[PDB]
Amino acid sequence: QPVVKSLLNSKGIHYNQGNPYNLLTPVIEKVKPGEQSFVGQHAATGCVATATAQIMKYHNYPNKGLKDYTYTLSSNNPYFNHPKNLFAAISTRQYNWNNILPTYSGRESNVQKMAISELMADVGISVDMDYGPSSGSAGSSRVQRALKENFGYNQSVHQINRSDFSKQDWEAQIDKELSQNQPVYYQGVGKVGGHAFVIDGADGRNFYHVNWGWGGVSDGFFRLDALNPSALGTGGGAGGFNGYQSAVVGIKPL
Ligand SMILES: *[C@@H](C(=O)O)[C@H](O)C(=O)N[C@@H](CC(C)C)C(=O)NCCCCNC(N)=[NH2+]
Numbered sequence: 001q002p003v004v005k006s007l008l009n010s011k012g013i014h015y016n017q018g019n020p021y022n023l024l025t026p027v028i029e030k031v032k033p034g035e036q037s038f039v040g041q042h043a044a045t046g047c048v049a050t051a052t053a054q055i056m057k058y059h060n061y062p063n064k065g066l067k068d069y070t071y072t073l074s075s076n077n078p079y080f081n082h083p084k085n086l087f088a089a090i091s092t093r094q095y096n097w098n099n100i101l102p103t104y105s106g107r108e109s110n111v112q113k114m115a116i117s118e119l120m121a122d123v124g125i126s127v128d129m130d131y132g133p134s135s136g137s138a139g140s141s142r143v144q145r146a147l148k149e150n151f152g153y154n155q156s157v158h159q160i161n162r163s164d165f166s167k168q169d170w171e172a173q174i175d176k177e178l179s180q181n182q183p184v185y186y187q188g189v190g191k192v193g194g195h196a197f198v199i200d201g202a203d204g205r206n207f208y209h210v211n212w213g214w215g216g217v218s219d220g221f222f223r224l225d226a227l228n229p230s231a232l233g234t235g236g237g238a239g240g241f242n243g244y245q246s247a248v249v250g251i252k253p254l
Contacts, residue, residue: 156250188241
């Protein structure tokens with residue numbers, strides 16, 4: 001396994017799912033019965049959107065979006081009145097990568113905050129995000145399609161599933177991406193829920209660097225069969241994203 005220093009840390013890239021990343025997600029409309037109110041707050045960007053946007057900022061690409069996207073929320077979502085249709089005019093976008101900064105600490109201009117919030121909202125719409133105080137998407141299968149069809153990435157983009165490969169062949173694909181300076185979108189599920197994140201480095205001892213999409217919290221080196229950040233879990237136990245894993249690889253511009 002070659003040593004590859006964290007590609008996202010090397011470029012300063014640290015996004016998360018709350019403000020000022022979520023300034024253009026839908027505003028929550030209803031209180032879910034039994035829950036405290038989030039009415040009038042913007043929804044979370046979604047882990048799937050935050051992982052994808054960090055990889056897109058690594059490339060500063062595309063300069064122009066390619067194709068619009070429209071979808072309708074599930075009628076089971078208790079945070080919105082129904083029907084609720086969402087639309088992003090991606091085909092008209094000119095993304096200014098000098099305003100979509102690598103990270104935000106609050107002192108940035110409204111233009112800079114809106115620029116990352118527009119990317120996040122466009123990416124989450126393109127993956128059919130189920131918006132809420134937490135926001136969820138199917139992930140990989142939607143991400144690979146959106147990067148090519150809506151954002152003009154190369155036909156090399158594709159999903160790979162962990163169950164289709166030996167451990168050696170799975171890690172060899174990850175290593176090859178990293179050797180080509182290509183961060184990898186990754187997700188999995190387990191006893192502290194499901195999450196999407198970015199693999200962007202390797203230490204030579206079969207651990208990989210992970211950026212979890214929480215602003216920096218828990219980022220570090222993990223085995224791909226023990227993707228277990230300590231920021232999650234209540235009560236003192238174990239858990240991580242070790243089941244039903246998939247990745248999107250080949251992520252580079254046309
Ligand atoms: C992850 C996060 O914000 O931490 C976020 O919960 C998420 O996207 N979870 C996914 C599963 C992971 C990507 C492994 C999820 O919600 N899966 C279920 C389907 C979600 C809703 N999608 C549609 N189209 N209704």
